[PDB]
């Protein structure tokens, strides 16, 4: 029934080292990994020379991720100003040539 359960029994037991049935968070919740050149998210490489596993390749939930985001300098969707300049004489305009 508890398929959504990340953690359980965040308390100390006065006798035993950990309460029975206590559930630590999965390592995947905390592997921030890397944004890849593609924009695909990845977990950290498990051993040297390996690429990391894409986070979407697999069913674990990862709660730390690198989101790319534009800074104040980049702006988009602002209306843009220009000097429009009309033809000097309408009769001189060339509708035709290829």
């Amino acid at each position: 029934i508890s398929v959504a359960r990340s953690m359980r029994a965040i308390v100390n037991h006065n006798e035993v080292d950990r309460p029975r049935g206590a559930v630590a968070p999965s390592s995947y919740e905390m592997d921030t990994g890397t944004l890849s050149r593609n924009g695909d998210l990845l977990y950290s490489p498990v051993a040297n020379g390996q690429v990391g596993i894409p986070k979407l390749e697999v069913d674990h939930i990862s709660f730390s991720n690198v989101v790319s985001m534009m800074t104040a300098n980049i702006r988009t969707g602002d209306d843009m100003a220009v000097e429009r300049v009309n033809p000097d004489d309408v009769r001189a305009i060339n509708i035709r040539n290829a």
Partner: protein, 148 residues
């Protein structure tokens, strides 16, 4: 939860999380990580912050941004539409904002699809486009009604 490390009073949890974090395979972080300055202005543009967020939303946010930056279509390209909707041989100038003002490319394919579709569903669409063109003629001042 990786932030609970050495802060939670629950010992087993702190131990476990310390173990997971001390593994080679897993490393928590709270970006900024990747700065990217412009080639001309030399100021930062897109930056990679390692947020606490689900990988799905992050993947969608990144998909969108990747779209906007990889298009290599700056705001200057709006001029090309302006020329189309302008009298032949108008000139346009400035201001050459450059990479700093990116935009998505005009989606030709999808628009022509939606147009053919609507024209199928809504014949009255004809009267909309005509109306637009009518107004242009009306503003071009080519011909005026007269009493004579």
């Amino acid at each position: 939860p990786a932030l609970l490390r050495d802060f939670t009073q629950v010992n087993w949890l702190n131990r476990d999380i310390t173990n997971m974090l001390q593994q080679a395979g897993t490393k928590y972080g709270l970006g900024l990580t990747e700065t990217r300055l412009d080639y001309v202005r030399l100021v930062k543009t897109i930056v990679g912050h390692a947020l606490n967020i689900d990988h799905f939303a992050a993947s969608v946010l990144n998909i969108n941004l990747r779209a906007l930056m990889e298009a290599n279509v700056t705001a200057d390209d709006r001029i090309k539409a302006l020329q189309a909707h302008s009298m032949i041989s108008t000139q346009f100038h400035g201001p050459n904002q450059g990479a700093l003002r990116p935009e998505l490319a005009f989606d030709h394919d999808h628009i022509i699809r939606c147009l053919m579709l609507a024209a199928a569903n809504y014949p009255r669409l004809e009267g909309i486009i005509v109306q637009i063109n009518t107004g242009y003629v009306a503003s071009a001042n080519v011909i005026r009604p007269v009493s004579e």
